[PDB]
Amino acid sequence: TSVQTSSLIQSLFDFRLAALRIHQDSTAKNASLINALVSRDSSRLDEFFSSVDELELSNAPDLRFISSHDNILWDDGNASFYGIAQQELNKLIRRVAISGNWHLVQTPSEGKSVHILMRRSSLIEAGGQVVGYLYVGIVLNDNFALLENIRSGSNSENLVLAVDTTPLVSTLKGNEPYSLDYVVHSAKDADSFIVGQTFLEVESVPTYLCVYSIQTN
């Protein structure tokens, strides 16, 4: 049923965000991180995160960077691969004002605007305090792994993650009877290929992220 797959899709989505939050908040309390940081040895923080992912590459964020006010002490350097300019990253610092909550934000890239789910976690020190903030983000554009993981987890035929009429990522192979174009401009829960619509909530808050789910009669 509509609301039932929609419900499942949302939980699968929540599941991925929960995994990142948990690891984020846990790493935010790792002395190693805190001291590697305080040393302001920008370049030392590098092996550290490499170690964190070394053991969990699967659940790693697409981008990480540490802030201290409008300053950026460190950046894993992935923002660049996404065409995100170091300066836009600074603007995100402000955007994601509070901690403990995921933020759906969009940034200009070397092309279309990139949609990102970001979250901030305070970096406190051994019994002193805030030495900075760790920001982690998930880039939605072309994030095939994220969408496919939801498709399989929900045993859906195909999924399309979009913003309005513009697709961010799709699981369609291309050999389907229906095209991406049809799926995005389709009318919800109506045919040979029933297309459900699910607007994802982030932190129980409504968003414009729409997941189109396709199922054949």
Reading across the β-sheet that carries 71-75, which strands appear in turn?
A: 71-75, 63-68, 132-139, 114-123, 103-107
Assigned CATH for 156-217? 2.20.20.100
**Strand (E) positions, the chain?**
63-68, 71-75, 103-107, 114-123, 132-139, 158-163, 166-170, 193-202, 205-216
Provide the experimental method for this PDB entry.
X-ray
Q: Are strands 71-75 and 103-107 parallel, antiparallel or unpaired?
A: unpaired
Q: What are phi and psi of 203, to 5 degrees?
A: 60, 45
Domain range 1-155, CATH class: alpha beta
Find residue 133's DSSP bridge partners. Answer: 67, 122
| Number of other CB atoms surrounding residue 4 within 10 Å | 10
Find residue 215's DSSP bridge partners. Answer: 194
Domain map of the chain by residue range?
1-155, 156-217
DSSP states of 20-72 = HHHHHHHHTT-HHHHHHHHTT-TTTHHHHHHHHHHTTGGG--SEEEEEETBEE
Q: How far is CA 175 from the centre of its chain?
A: 28
Structure token digits, residue 100: 């403990």
Which is nearest to 144 in space by CA: 170, 105, 173?
A: 170
| Cα–Cα distance measured from residue 135 to residue 55, given in angstroms and rounded to the nearest whole number | 20
Helix (H) or strand (E) segment spanning residue 92 = helix 86-95
